[PDB]
Symmetry: D2
Subunit: 100 residues, 4 copies
């Protein structure tokens, strides 16, 4: 999905992400979550998996990393809002963070 999520889609997709720890940013139609690992080795291994998925689906995250911390913000710049692509990427990220 390249268009903004509908009210119905948000009610059916966001609750699960919120339950997983993601939050909706106050200033942008985007979701955000910070992941913490044991060290940089584990953090970057995680980032490499996310990077691979980003190229597989042609959708990229905004992210900041400092050693074992990875802060991720997902939104679609081509339309300026949250799309199904962001939800899909978030779901993959949760799998990667859980080693699944």
């Amino acid at each position: 999905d390249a268009q903004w999520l509908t009210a119905e889609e948000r009610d059916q997709l966001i609750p699960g992400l919120k339950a997983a720890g993601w939050s909706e940013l106050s200033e942008r139609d985007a979701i955000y979550k910070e992941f913490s690992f044991k060290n940089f080795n584990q953090a970057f291994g995680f980032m490499s998996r996310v990077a691979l998925q980003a190229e597989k689906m042609n959708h990229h995250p905004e992210w900041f990393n400092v050693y074992n911390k990875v802060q991720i913000t997902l939104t679609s710049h081509d339309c300026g809002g949250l799309t199904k692509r962001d939800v899909k990427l978030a779901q993959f990220i949760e799998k990667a963070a859980a080693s699944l």
Copy 2:
């Protein structure tokens, strides 16, 4: 190097990095530079090379990435300032970016 850069060291090593595009932050004793690649494939390949060097040196960057852009801030948190480790990592980053 693990100790803060002396005045002489800064004069000898920082100008080259500034000529290469790095700048010194005003609120912190740290250097910064935004790199712009063609796409994320190039950007992450570059990040992977920097990540390898980070573990080789046990010195890590503070960095942000969005598609083809990579913003890097370097400083030594252990002593709260710039050290030769930051200079060496920045020099490696320049080679990897080229």
Copy 3:
């Protein structure tokens, strides 16, 4: 492309790759090339770029690595032969290696 390369396609696309250092295996319809970098940092950075492209194309290489060396064999297992996917991945590999 997902179907086996035709005679015309092979004549049009393979010579360039051979000029670049790729060779055709004798026991399989596949192309091969060993890349030699300066070190593992360069080699793995290169591998990371190829890995990203592999997932973008959903087409994977058969590769071996030891420090600065990376041996790559390309073929399409789905049909047991060379396809345009192999040619396109090889061309990307050439750019990444440069």
Copy 4:
């Protein structure tokens, strides 16, 4: 350790690796193990972690990858045999494969 493992060291270090699935190659003083993941994404994420450790310890593996399979052979070419460095790398690899 940059020298070959002693008979004593082999008796105290190899059993654990054998128990983990590693085997001693017949033609070389090296250890070998094949790892299988769900897909290439997981396999390469694993490889990135191993790559990071290889640069951290300045010791590199011989490895072959085809999609979800990663075959790893560990030995020290600077002396032509198995060293403490190979054991250390093997132990890290086991952690990475287990997501630890």
